[PDB]
Amino acid sequence: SLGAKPFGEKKFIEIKGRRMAYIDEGTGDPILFQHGNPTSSYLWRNIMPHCAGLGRLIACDLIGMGDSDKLDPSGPERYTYAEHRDYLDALWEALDLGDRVVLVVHDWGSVLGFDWARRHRERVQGIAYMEAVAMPLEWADFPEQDRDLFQAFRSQAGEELVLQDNVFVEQVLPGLILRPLSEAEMAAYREPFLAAGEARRPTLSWPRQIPIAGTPADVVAIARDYAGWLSESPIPKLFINAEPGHLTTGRIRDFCRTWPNQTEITVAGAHFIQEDSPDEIGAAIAAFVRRLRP
Ligand SMILES: [Ca+2]
Ligand SMILES: [Cl-]
Numbered sequence: 654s655l656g657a658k659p660f661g662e663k664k665f666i667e668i669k670g671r672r673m674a675y676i677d678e679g680t681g682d683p684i685l686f687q688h689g690n691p692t693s694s695y696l697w698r699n700i701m702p703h704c705a706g707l708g709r710l711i712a713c714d715l716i717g718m719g720d721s722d723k724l725d726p727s728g729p730e731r732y733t734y735a736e737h738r739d740y741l742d743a744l745w746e747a748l749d750l751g752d753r754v755v756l757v758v759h760d761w762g763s764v765l766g767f768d769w770a771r772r773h774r775e776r777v778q779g780i781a782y783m784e785a786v787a788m789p790l791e792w793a794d795f796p797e798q799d800r801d802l803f804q805a806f807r808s809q810a811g812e813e814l815v816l817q818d819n820v821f822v823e824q825v826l827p828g829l830i831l832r833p834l835s836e837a838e839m840a841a842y843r844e845p846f847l848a849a850g851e852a853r854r855p856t857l858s859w860p861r862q863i864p865i866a867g868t869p870a871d872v873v874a875i876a877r878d879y880a881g882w883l884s885e886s887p888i889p890k891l892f893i894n895a896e897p898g899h900l901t902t903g904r905i906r907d908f909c910r911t912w913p914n915q916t917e918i919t920v921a922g923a924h925f926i927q928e929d930s931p932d933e934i935g936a937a938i939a940a941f942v943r944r945l946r947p
Contacts, residue, residue: 655931657837660698660712663720668743674720675713675744679706682753682778684942685745686712689760690859691821693719695841696759696927703935707942708755711748715761716740717855718845727851732858734764734872741765752776755942759783759927760900761859764872767879774886779945781938783893784901784924787909788880789873790865794905806860815857822846822856829899829924838928883912890915891941893934899924916941 661678676694684704688696694712701710714721715737724731755778758766763785770777792800802825805814814820822843827834834842846853864872883890892915894901901909910917918937920930927934 655699657835657841658698659695659841660701661710663694665720666744666747668740668747671716671722671724671740673714673716673722673740673744675748676701676711677748678710679708681708682755682946683709683711683748683750684755684757684938685750685766686710686757687759687762687766688712688715688718689762689764691718691826691846691856692760692842692925693845695719696925697757699931700757700927700935700938703932703939704942707939707946711750713741713744715765715855720845723852724854727854729858732855734862734869734875737761738765738768742769745769750776753778755779755781755945757781757938758785760785760924763787764864764876767883768875770888771879771882774882774888777888779889779891779941780883781891781893781941782909783926783934784895784899784922785909786864786876787883787901787905789867789876790863790905792866794900794903795865796899799899803860803863806857807863811857811861816850816853819843819846819849819853819856821860822853826925830928831921831923832929834928880908884908885913887914889941889945891937892917893926893937894919895922895924895926895929896920897923898926 661676663674664677665672665674686697693714697712717723754776756766763782862872864876896919920933922929
């Protein structure tokens, strides 16, 4: 079903002098769900229940997002990908995941999860992905309509758009979900970002870090690395395709459709497809997991 209620209860743990929030329910091997920008663990609330009893169900809030602590002092050099990865690697380590992890990823969760998976390949049992950064991007991979806005995030205009006006939460988010969100739903997405200024910094630092047209060079290299590895890895994969979709279409989709040992389904959605087809997404993940854990 749909619903505005969160899944499970938020737990907290100290990492690098900051508290990080996460959902961790049940026993066994982890099914590890990673949200991206501008969302949180909340993104998976109607998907995680389909995996009830199939393992340990985990959804972490990235540093500065959801119920995780803000970075202090926050500024234009904080919340880089390398910074998020440092906090996330340490969190995942502290959680004692073992060596049979199923990853479920989206958006920046996919850059982070694909990267982690390449670096910890032996520990990774399966990868389910949707609307993911399969490879370094080009401006031609972006739907025409959304190009100028994303380019403006990556210019001097970005602070006003995002820190002042919360454009990523209030415009991009609902704009890339096909069904209308409820009041309670937008409230939960708005909450980490209620205040103008540095509270919203993660939602602007993220689009500045997107590996597009060669830049930033460190994130491009990481994405080129995992692109090459994923196209060769025999690790089982579930590609959840979306129609009309958003990021994972055209050339990007061409590429991830070359990856080996892969099942695919198509669901209704643009980018944040979890809000459009939760049950279809949840059911495919659960079947995938059942097949990997007979
Ligand atoms: Ca909409
Ligand atoms: Cl972004």
